[PDB]
A paper describes a structure:
The VMXi beamline and its associated PXF within the Research Complex at Harwell offer a highly automated pipeline where researchers provide a suitable protein sample that is used for robotic crystallization, monitoring and subsequent in situ data collection from crystals in crystallization plates or in thin-film sample delivery systems.
The entire LVPRGS thrombin site was also visible in all three monomers at the N-terminus of Δ57aa-NCOA7 protein, due to the cloning strategy for subcloning into pET15b vector.
Author numbering: 13 to 183
The structure:
């Protein structure tokens, strides 16, 4: 029940982080998670997130801490990359620890799982709505309810600012 070595998300160990590990697919259950990208350690930009993810042979966990110290993110079946079309598959889900742990799994309504653009990263879709959105600097973020996951707003408000962001891998 510990965050990866070198992670700065140690606040999760007091939020019962095993709630998230239990929601991982049995595919990756039992595999230790490791820190693949950290904004504090490796710099903050969407480009660096893509570059740090290019060598991952594993699904990933996106862990975001906003300026209200609320922690949330996503489990992606595919490492985050630039593409000209949506990717990711049915095991992709969103999660939040605010105000308590909640998971938002695939609803089967659409397959708008992940969209990695040059200037934004994006999860969830349907009617032009985004479940989770991050700008090119991984600074301004947004979270709405989307049909892909039937999620709640992951943080206190729709808009948030990234205080710290990490990507964990299992390979």
């Amino acid at each position: 029940g510990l965050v990866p070595r070198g992670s700065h998300m140690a606040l999760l160990e007091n939020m019962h982080i095993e709630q998230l590990a239990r929601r991982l697919p049995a595919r990756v259950q039992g595999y230790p998670w490791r820190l693949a990208y950290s904004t504090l350690e490796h710099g903050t930009s969407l480009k660096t997130l893509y570059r740090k993810s290019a060598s991952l042979d594993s699904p990933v966990l996106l862990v975001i801490k906003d300026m209200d110290n609320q922690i949330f993110g996503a489990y992606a079946t595919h490492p985050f990359k630039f593409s000209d079309h949506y990717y990711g598959t049915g095991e992709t889900f969103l999660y939040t620890f605010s105000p308590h742990f909640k998971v938002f799994k695939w609803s089967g309504e659409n397959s708008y799982f992940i969209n990695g653009d040059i200037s934004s990263l994006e999860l969830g879709g349907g009617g032009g709505r985004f479940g989770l959105w991050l700008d090119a600097d991984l600074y301004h973020g947004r979270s709405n309810s989307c049909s892909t996951f039937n999620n709640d707003i992951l943080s206190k408000k729709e808009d948030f600012i990234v205080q710290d962001l990490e990507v964990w891998a299992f390979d």
